[PDB]
């Protein structure tokens, strides 16, 4: 049976810890994939952590140079949420240096992008086998979400980008049923930049909060209807949530336009709450350290700076990284609404640390009816490792 | 289908060995979580060992300082009973430095407590996802059983404490159905202290034998009715079963009050047998070494010193630690009564031994219709380990 | 549904290789239990290798002194047939330094013997939990088959011994249904000695070929009826199949009495074939090296020396050890008869080799309609290991 | 339910990456079987990688001399496609130094060949147990496909060879139902040589492209009908696809006869496409380096040199090796045709490299409706390994 996912996102007062994998600490001795870009997505029966391996293990010579993003060895794999990305519990998914994945109620669909930068191929898998593909349409690192795609009533949606990472690119919405592409649209967004969308279902639509890697320190927003018409813009709130970013005091905000005039960025997320927004961000304005989430009153629909809740999940003495959105299936939560959850990637190694390698672990949080106290569920691994000596 | 668990506890003459995981011996070479606080609980299909990891492995540098109780890295995980807490067979449960877990016949409910000491959060999971929470109500290390909680006809019960570990604290009973809290009560117990309850079903009620960490060397007793009224007191028997404790000769006993005038303690258990009691305890009066279980005639209902059976499972030349109660589902035993079983934690490392780490393994015993001979199924690991050199 | 196992044993011309685990070779680097006494038994869905661990791993310091037979750390565990006894694929069964196990069509029954030599306890498990026990009845190392027990129409049978290993002991047949003992008998056998029976179903009865560790170099035979009456004696054939043994030329044979006047022995097996017998044995008369199986015409019912088939599975340049019998379920083979299969234990280390440890691997063979060529599927590990240096 | 597999092979424009196991890179630290001869085959539920172990692990002393082809330690095992051949995820299949395997819709059938060169035994397993055998009929290394066998409507077909590897041998087709041999035929092919067939279903027949290890640099072709009549010859195309081979310019081609006058070879594959052919081959004419696949117009039915598509999957700076064919079940793809897929073995170590060992990893590709860009998904391991120093 297909997951409906037509419900509204639950309104939440805070986020409770779901899981923590401790992958890099475990990987000091155990047999753990060197990874990055982990993310969580759920079937009616379980949630899983997906991750992009470097085709190599922590504390091994082959983990050298893994700060690098793309290689013929990178693969999309998965384990149960909270499990480390160890070899012996991992399910192979796809050959990928960029990925998205989601379940439609019947089977898992995964999308793994691999191949040369100038002519990359995205392979769509459904039920454990290749069923369709997408070739690069702009010849410049075809790529996608690095978090859960979104299935509503049996059709699954995701966002892809092809083109420059620092100027105007091209962006598309794809739609599949049972692993077969049944629709696609170009996203018109001149002056804007869309990368690494974090999406979720809400009121029968797909809402996405993404990454502007061009000029914006506020995040692009994309609301997708099943017919593939869309509304695109920026998260209205007068609070910048990208990294690097400027100070809140010096930021104005816009529903339509990038602001902040800074390059680069980091994958991040947001949840709509009626007209409010939960927005995640690193504590540091310049570095990928710390992680907090703010509820901005009316932040979804106007340039509001009215912060009504704030919760810290990783302190600023510790490394963070990417973050992304997913929802709990009604079949698992037992709710009449979609429980909003997020994950935080905690990057260790290069370029910040004294190692030959780069990897990451994850902490997972889910929205609840209560305020949750500030804490830090940081990575906690002790660097350098043996292989670095 | 919900497990009824309305039957009486089986009357038993002795305890047969169920399992032994050999985790620390195996962990000399294999990939085994550094743990403590293990415990067993059963679904209609299998029994599992739950444990609190230190988010690190035996014989690794990250096992340093693991004598410590609370950290952001500790997680509740589980394997099949008798299996070591190895990485590759473990199921993630919750983020936790204190935990309880039980099955209701349909799904597993787990409760993991993490967060800061002053404002800890307990997260209730059901079927593998967060479904509810409990915030600290007294701001002082919210905490719970460290053994199986108890499900009767679909509702699950457990005991939590919030407050000082060495003076008057606050104690509560919680009740859930399908991962959702449907009831709670404050336990009135001025002059008494309740920690780390070991519970089990008996005649449609939840019986608990707990730990007084304040003044008592006898164990608090809590009998919970489904409506959440309760009777609370001390295990009547004129035999002290906490550690540290005084000599039996110098102990009087009380059904209502703590006795012994000593601080500290250790998690322990007891089974009612009509009006008798099976009470477990360390052989040593001062240290966590050895383990024996005594059947005291009329020990549940009066200050009796009449020991009618005694069985040793770990000798006094060897380290023990915590111990806890669980029952075999009727669906597994095939009995018309609930088979009483217990587990013994065997702690190795600090503070007693010459290592940088603390962990433990477990032996599991189940009540039978026969007397069982004394023996010692001790941990058997050879310390120090390589990482200590 | 219960397995009937009322059919006749298939008549076979030879034995084809089923499996080989390579446990000790793999254990040079992988995480493998130090074991001995492995054996195979089958459910309607799969065959599994059971084994007695030493609660320690190959190439680890804790594998020291594992030539020893009994300890509090030994456990019965299992994996799929052909898999090594690695940690990460193993299912815990029982605490045991002696064991038997078999499936009744619905669930696995296992019997693990542990405890002190003078008062050992056998624990019967069914469906993964303790359901019954047997206490030592003669106070001298209660012990059992070390191979598959035998289930016919839902009732399971096995043979146990209690008493001296080198003089007259006591021997019993046990019968269980669903993990509960429903019958037992003393085996009258003055002058004879029964150890480590290898049994199988045949024509609605349990046939066993065992080990005389007292005076006999021929093997005791036990035919058990469901009502627990029995016939007991020695395998008639004028060929001795125990180890150590004398030369064939100097052996007479007897259906009723031990012959050969030598102490010690080794677990071995035999299959009835009408009135013929397949008998396994080490090639060496004195040492546990090599393995061959002979079909002796009329060897089951008379002192025949007429060898009609001979097949070698391990050459005499290589170490062997125990061997045992099991049958393929009709539900798996698709036959109208019970396929006879055997396993051979290949012991490495002490006392023959230059190591601190003793372990073993296994090769598994199943009867077919064809002659199979001689070969040697020996252990192949290269000793000493690192831990021995 | 039996898989029909009566459909036509899908016509494909290119091949998308399915999987990559990274076994040898992972094996630098993890616990990975030393293997060779991997291959993929699919049930209605999943595809699996089968492989022949050396009964030893990467980076262990026992991996020494593994350039060798046949030993008593080699076993057929399997994991999920894309997973490394690690110990802890592997399912035992058969004792084998040559193998084939396929699923009939109900259960897996495997065929493992082991024993002495002069009298080898092939054991057929079905549903996890031995059900039948084939003894050497020509006394000279009985052997088979090293890729998926082929099941059509419940009957499974494969090709075996017995005899010289460099002159006229003997070749047979076998047919089984539910693990039982129900038919066989001798293949008449004087002047020709058939090894290591790569087969697949097409229009209710079994098509095979094989290896001539005698004189031919073009590949033998075998089309098998269910009644076991056959047509045998050579892949017509005027392009040689064996290794070693001569230049394309100097090759003529033949539907009936070997051409090229060179010894040796390598396992390879081909897919019929109407009258066209997809033929795989190493880029190098002399060495097992690189891998490309050519679509030759009318290449199946005439000596055509008309190359209409070309796709590279491993560049000529990198080691390749064997390659083989399989199809996606309709039950998995959702197609009305059989999706053609292939795997490429990437051999590392001896004789080309500076190690004591030989192993390999694999990349898997499946036919799609699109052209796929050239790339190289090479092994990527860094040699020598620690054990080589
Ligand atoms: C800006 C998104 C993308 C453009 C190619 O680059 C990602 C940058 C990045 C990061 O840590 O900021 C990590 C990713 N692995 C990059 N993605 C790819 C497909 O190379
Ligand atoms: C006395 C119970 C509890 C109060 C916070 O402390 C436990 C003491 C303990 C022990 O070995 O006696 C081990 C536990 N890990 C402690 N529990 C917590 C939640 O810190
Ligand atoms: C003779 C059977 C038994 C009597 C206690 O001893 C077994 C001897 C043995 C061997 O290799 O010959 C190995 C077993 N582990 C012994 N069994 C026990 C229960 O100690
Ligand atoms: C030519 C096929 C076969 C004849 C015995 O030899 C195979 C050669 C080979 C190779 O890499 O070319 C590898 C295989 N393991 C060989 N097969 C066997 C059964 O020895
Ligand atoms: C031994 C080895 O391969 N070292 C390389 C180093 O030379 C290279 O410059 C770096 C990439 O940036 O990656 C390491 O893996
Ligand atoms: C290298 C390292 O981290 N060593 C620390 C030690 O300095 C610290 O005092 C102790 C905690 O008590 O824990 C060890 O882990
Ligand atoms: C370091 C250690 O424990 N060595 C012991 C050795 O002293 C003992 O004599 C032998 C048993 O026979 O077993 C080894 O394990
Ligand atoms: C220590 C050892 O066994 N070394 C052997 C070597 O002597 C032998 O010549 C070679 C086979 O070719 O295989 C290695 O395994
Ligand atoms: Ca930006
Ligand atoms: Ca106390
Ligand atoms: Ca004897
Ligand atoms: Ca050739």
Author numbering:
A (entry chain A), B (entry chain A), C (entry chain A), D (entry chain A): 83 to 169, 169A, 170 to 306, 308 to 330, 330A, 330B, 332 to 333, 335 to 342, ...
Q: How is this structure described in the published paper?
A:
The parental compound within this class is the Oseltamivir isomer 4, in which the cyclohexene double bond has been moved to the C2–C3 position. In both N8:4 and N8:5 complexes, the inhibitors bound in a position and orientation very similar to that observed previously in structures of N8:1. In particular, N8:4 overlays almost exactly with N8:1, with only a subtle repositioning of the C7 atom due to the change in position of the double bond in the cyclohexene ring relative to 1. Surprisingly, given the lower activity of compound 4 in in vitro inhibition assays, no further significant differences in the position of the compound's pendant groups or active site residues were observed. The structures of the N8:4 and N8:5 complexes are remarkably similar to N8:1, suggesting that the reduced susceptibility of these compounds is not due to substantial changes to the position of the compounds within the active site. While the inhibition of 4 against the H274Y virus was poor (ED50 > 500 μM), the concentration of 5 required was approximately 10-fold higher than for wild-type virus (ED50 = 34 μM compared to ED50 = 3.9 μM).
Inhibition of this process prevents the release of nascent virions from the surface of the cell, reducing the spread of the infection. Specifically, in the active sites of group 1 NAs a loop, consisting of residues 147–152 (the 150-loop), adopts a conformation leading to the opening of a pocket to the side of the active site (also known as the 150 cavity).
